[PDB]
Amino acid sequence: LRLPSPEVYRFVVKDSEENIVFEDNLQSRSGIPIIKGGTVVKLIERLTYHMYADPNFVRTFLTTYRSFCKPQELLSLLIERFEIPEPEKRFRKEYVQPVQLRILNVFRHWVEHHFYDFERDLYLLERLESFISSVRGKAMKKWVESIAKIIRRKKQAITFASPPPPIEWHISKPGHIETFDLMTLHPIEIARQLTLLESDLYRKVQPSELVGSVWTKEDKEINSPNLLKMIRHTTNLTLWFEKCIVEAENFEERVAVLSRIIEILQVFQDLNNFNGVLEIVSAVNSVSVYRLDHTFEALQERKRKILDEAVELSQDHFKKYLVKLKSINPPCVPFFGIYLTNILKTEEGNNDFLDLINFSKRRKVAEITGEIQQYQNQPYCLRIEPDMRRFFENLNPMGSASEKEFTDYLFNKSLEIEPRNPKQPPRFPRKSTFSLKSPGIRPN
Numbered sequence: 001l002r003l004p005s006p007e008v009y010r011f012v013v014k015d016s017e018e019n020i021v022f023e024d025n026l027q028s029r030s031g032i033p034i035i036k037g038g039t040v041v042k043l044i045e046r047l048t049y050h051m052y053a054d055p056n057f058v059r060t061f062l063t064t065y066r067s068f069c070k071p072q073e074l075l076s077l078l079i080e081r082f083e084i085p086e087p088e089k090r091f092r093k094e095y096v097q098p099v100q101l102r103i104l105n106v107f108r109h110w111v112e113h114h115f116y117d118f119e120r121d122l123y124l125l126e127r128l129e130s131f132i133s134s135v136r137g138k139a140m141k142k143w144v145e146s147i148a149k150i151i152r153r154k155k156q157a158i159t160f161a162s163p164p165p166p167i168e169w170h171i172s173k174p175g176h177i178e179t180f181d182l183m184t185l186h187p188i189e190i191a192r193q194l195t196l197l198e199s200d201l202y203r204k205v206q207p208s209e210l211v212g213s214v215w216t217k218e219d220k221e222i223n224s225p226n227l228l229k230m231i232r233h234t235t236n237l238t239l240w241f242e243k244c245i246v247e248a249e250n251f252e253e254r255v256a257v258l259s260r261i262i263e264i265l266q267v268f269q270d271l272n273n274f275n276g277v278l279e280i281v282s283a284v285n286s287v288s289v290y291r292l293d294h295t296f297e298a299l300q301e302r303k304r305k306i307l308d309e310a311v312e313l314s315q316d317h318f319k320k321y322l323v324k325l326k327s328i329n330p331p332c333v334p335f336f337g338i339y340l341t342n343i344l345k346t347e348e349g350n351n352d353f354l355d356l357i358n359f360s361k362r363r364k365v366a367e368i369t370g371e372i373q374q375y376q377n378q379p380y381c382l383r384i385e386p387d388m389r390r391f392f393e394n395l396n397p398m399g400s401a402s403e404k405e406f407t408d409y410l411f412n413k414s415l416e417i418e419p420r421n422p423k424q425p426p427r428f429p430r431k432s433t434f435s436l437k438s439p440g441i442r443p444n
Helices: 040-046 055-067 071-082 090-113 116-120 122-132 143-155 188-202 211-216 225-246 251-272 273-285 293-297 302-326 337-349 359-375 387-391 403-417
Strands: 018-021 035-036
Touching: 035 040, 035 273, 035 359, 040 055, 040 071, 055 211, 055 359, 071 122, 090 122, 090 143, 116 122, 122 143, 143 337, 188 225, 188 273, 188 387, 211 225, 211 337, 211 359, 225 251, 225 273, 225 302, 225 403, 251 293, 251 302, 302 337, 337 359, 337 387, 387 403
Parallel strands: none
Antiparallel strands: 018 035
């Protein structure tokens, strides 16, 4: 069989160590070879290889390719692959038709599982639709129609499976958002509404938003929009908890605020919202709060124990947290920070290139990112409270200041309320008038 000249069809350059690398271990003896790396041209060739189907590679490629190739570039490479020149016959049935069918399979998987690429770039979709509508051959019609049906369905776009609990109210009453505060809302319902918010943010994050540490790179707002939303929420809530503690200048009120936050942590625990649990752990371990020895001393022993147990989840590289997560029954909200830390370690420990892309590096990262999805398909049986939801979505503890400026403010405020000297703290009056008494966390 006479393939075209590599001068005119880049993909058929002979395989060599200069363009494609395979795993060569005892697990790679039989079956489809395992790609370790290659030029993007050779990756595309193997993605659409005429000889055998390779669904594992198509899956891993479409999850990870944005770490080494832009979507517009991927579409161009697949079109280039499709437009097979005449040789420099059985060519058509054994080579061309399998390859074009392989390409249409890639297009189908792409729109089925990563249609967000097309939502983010309308011109990308314009290109795809124009190209597919030009593929009028008889052998291709079933695939063209399958792709078109998915694209139709994708553009086309709460039922409780059991009764949710009644919404809990404390001092703030419904409708009056102006009275909403950490201490005036009910601690049960604060936990519930933050869990619904965080679950929604978690469930929207795609694995491709983590591969290649793309959320830290210059195209982050395009590649990692849901992940960035989740990170910004976590930063805002953690800082809000710290602000609530450190701005409670009156000692009795501040002990009550910290105590209420521990109650919220307990409800987060009961909800398997480990993201919320470790947001509170982060806040109480921050430099501005952790140094408030007098406030922690005044806690009920049972509340200190609750807090100490939660803090111990994060110790020793989150050893106890990882154990806990594997044991629970969803719904749950996993602690998101740890995936970010583990991907950053893997990104920095492995080179992007072996111009040969290191694909085994992407396969390893795809293993980590794959773990996020098992917790994304169980919704909470909790009713949204729209005003509370708006309240927590609009948290902006930093105001107009930078985060560096705000955390400097928090530390100086901490030094004010509990000075770094051996004297007893000065005594400050309350500025608020609401009762400090908690309603507790057993539902009313």
